[PDB]
């Protein structure tokens with residue numbers, strides 16, 4: 001009896017509005033090609049205060065339950081990974097539980113480590129199940145965030161917001177994860193952070209890229225050693241990482257995925273028993289292979305390019321885009337995933353796409369999620385950005401979605417769309 | 419080959435200063451017996467800004483590693499449960515990793531759900547190990563918090579601060595946990611919370627007591643059903659809960675443990691097949707049994723009464739006090755633990771105290787930890803309370819301990835005591 005654990009399905013929620021990234025460039029006196037070619041952006045989600053971390057998380061989690069016909073009483077863990085917390089004590093997960101009218105027999109809590117928080121919660125849910133404690137039950141892990149750098153900042157064109165809700169179970173139709181094979185690399189850095197009382201992040205941008213790549217290298221190498229010992233990959237005519245059908249990466253901006261994939265391949269090329277016969281120039285040229293990027297990574301960025309950085313959710317939006325179109329082809333094949341969070345930590349893990357992944361992705365109806373949005377001007381984006389966090393716009397949520405309506409006596413109030 | 423997982427050892431850190439609780443009563447025009455008898459308090463830890471969540475967590479975690487001779491390279495997870503976070507993105511766990519100069523092959527993140535956050539992280543570490551993923555490695559889970567209600571508030575006499583660091587492993591000398599038997603009960607409430615930008619908690623105090631007891635009842639009942647089915651307890655001449663050698667509870671104030679134990683016993687008395695032959699009066703009198711409280715709970719409060727509410731750490735300070743004196747007697751016996759967090763969630767779990775628990779507790783040297791503190795006046799407590807979070811006092815940390823020294827260019831700086 002082969003037991004499996006992992007991601008059974010997912011759902012996505014996005015803010016109601018977005019801007020065209022070339023409009024942002026023009027408003028900032030920037031060449032639009034810096035954003036479209038340099039960063040790989042197309043459209044940037046923008047929010048108003050009604051689209052807070054709770055509202056986006058609850059919209060995604062409710063959509064998951066409805067689209068996948070989840071029995072809410074089978075949920076034994078509800079975890080929200082976020083870096084956009086709204087209370088020091090009361091977790092987003094508790095608000096989500098209430099808004100969705102979920103029953104009582106579940107753990108609820110939030111996880112925090114920049115863009116790694118969702119992955120940390122995913123592993124906690126997976127290992128709860130794989131330990132036996134969660135046998136017979138499911139978990140819901142929601143990655144929800146709003147990425148804000150501020151007007152006229154270098155990070156501004158990488159903003160975004162939204163949520164991805166993951167169903168975790170013993171029927172992991174999207175991704176049957178290889179338990180215990182993860183690689184991890186973490187160290188205390190100040191590449192990106194956001195002190196309490198600052199609405200916008202602080203970042204040393206180029207250093208943050210170096211930190212991502214450094215942590216990726218350590219995490220990937222740790223996974224590779226375990227995968228070699230488990231017989232899942234080999235040092236052969238193909239590099240170890242080439243034996244993964246696809247690799248999905250944390251996407252702070254779309255061009256980061258190419259940088260990440262080049263670095264992963266360089267790890268193989270530098271570590272091969274015969275590396276001494278190569279040069280930095282020859283290794284770099286091979287690592288940057290357009291064929292490899294096209295085969296393993298390129299199709300994972302379609303949703304990300306239209307939304308922006310959704311912090312904890314960015315890797316899972318890449319997984320979503322990949323499986324949206326390729327789940328049937330990928331059934332039975334092993335793929336890799338690299339999660340990074342500033343501060344920092346990276347974790348690399350693998351899993352096998354399930355036979356029913358295409359079914360679960362069809363039910364997620366992702367083009368309909370993206371089609372509901374409306375474009376706004378940069379002027380309006382700026383006006384909404386300037387609103388205080390307690391001042392949601394007077395607009396109704398979409399059917400089954402949620403919005404913050406007001407804060408009254410320090411208690412946050414929400415509405416569910418009819 | 420009987421596999422075991424759970425808590426191998428613990429260490430405690432407390433702030434350098436405390437006040438006498440009767441001095442606080444006099445300063446507030448309150449009868450001191452309200453605090454000493456009504457709440458069960460003796461001494462209240464007070465902080466200055468140098469004793470932040472990071473400094474307390476790092477002090478406790480470094481002390482654990484030194485006292486227990488942990489190989490730092492065997493740590494594969496470092497999790498901080500807290501409701502006193504200091505960054506929206508960068509976790510306390512990442513700062514602890516850096517301050518302790520720990521290596522890179524570990525997950526780092528923080529968990530959040532009021533006073534339940536530490537337990538959530540403990541279960542994530544336990545289940546990482548029990549799934550097989552953490553086989554051969556250990557985890558460190560630190561519960562670190564500073565409880566602040568504010569001058570002249572009803573919650574003020576229940577303040578406190580400190581940290582408890584837990585070593586989690588396949589050699590769980592303190593508590594070999596019963597994996598998969600936990601009971602849990604959670605629901606979305608506003609009993610206690612602390613919005614971003616508020617230094618002091620908001621609380622509906624009497625309602626928070628009702629919420630604790632309600633969630634406890636559900637969590638305990640869920641554990642009891644599983645423990646009955648596993649044959650660990652029986653409905654016999656003894657109530658199910660009486661078959662636990664001891665029960666430790668989240669301690670917001672010491673008298674809360676008696677309220678909690680009475681409620682747990684009432685759950686047994688109300689649920690017994692023959693409950694119809696009793697009355698509320700007879701059940702209450704039996705539930706309130708002094709003999710049962712004295713046998714199962716009373717000795718768990720010695721540290722808590724001298725520190726105050728340490729939020730996520732309060733239950734673990736109760737476990738510490740119990741094992742400090744009774745670990746040898748408890749070896750081979752099963753005990754219960756009830757974790758509660760406002761917002762809210764409760765989880766009830768059990769485990770068996772290990773043969774070497776007394777050894778591990780002796781190495782924690784807890785009376786020395788408490789002896790290092792100094793008493794201050796209420797006037798000085800108030801002066802320190804009024805200091806901004808970025809204004810630590812100019813005092814050195816104790817040997818091997820840590821303090822925040824300053825914030826410079828939005829980066830927190832720390833010192834390690836010589």
Ligand SMILES: CC(C)(COP(=O)([O-])OP(=O)([O-])OC[C@H]1O[C@@H](n2cnc3c(N)ncnc32)[C@H](O)[C@@H]1OP(=O)([O-])[O-])[C@@H](O)C(=O)NCCC(=O)NCCSC(=O)C[C@@](C)(O)CC(=O)[O-]
Pocket residue numbers: 031033034035037038039083113114115116154155156157158192203204205206208209212250251252253255256309311340341342507
């Ligand atoms: C990403 C930066 C640093 C870029 O901001 P920047 O410094 O203004 O941009 P640049 O000068 O680095 O240019 C970017 C690319 O555009 C090119 N370019 C320029 N002009 C043109 C043009 N006319 N036509 C065509 N191309 C053009 C340019 O040559 C370059 O190409 P590349 O170096 O990639 O090969 C900034 O947006 C930033 O700081 N963003 C936020 C930080 C971030 O996303 N870091 C990523 C790594 S850390 C991470 O992923 C974690 C994170 C951020 O998500 C946080 C968390 O975990 O919580």
Ligand SMILES: CC(C)(COP(=O)([O-])OP(=O)([O-])OC[C@H]1O[C@@H](n2cnc3c(N)ncnc32)[C@H](O)[C@@H]1OP(=O)([O-])[O-])[C@@H](O)C(=O)NCCC(=O)NCCSC(=O)C[C@@](C)(O)CC(=O)[O-]
Pocket residue numbers: 089449451452453455456457501531532533534572573574575576610621622623624626627630668669670671673674727729758759760
């Ligand atoms: C605990 C309260 C509500 C009490 O604050 P209060 O309302 O001022 O006190 P009280 O009137 O309820 O009195 C307390 C006890 O003192 C007695 N008393 C009175 N005077 C005398 C006297 N002269 N001589 C002898 N006894 C006296 C009095 O009769 C009573 O006895 P009891 O009802 O327990 O039997 C307040 O301190 C508060 O709000 N604290 C913070 C909230 C809290 O600790 N709640 C506990 C449950 S929730 C929890 O544990 C989660 C939490 C708080 O830790 C947060 C998280 O998870 O993050």
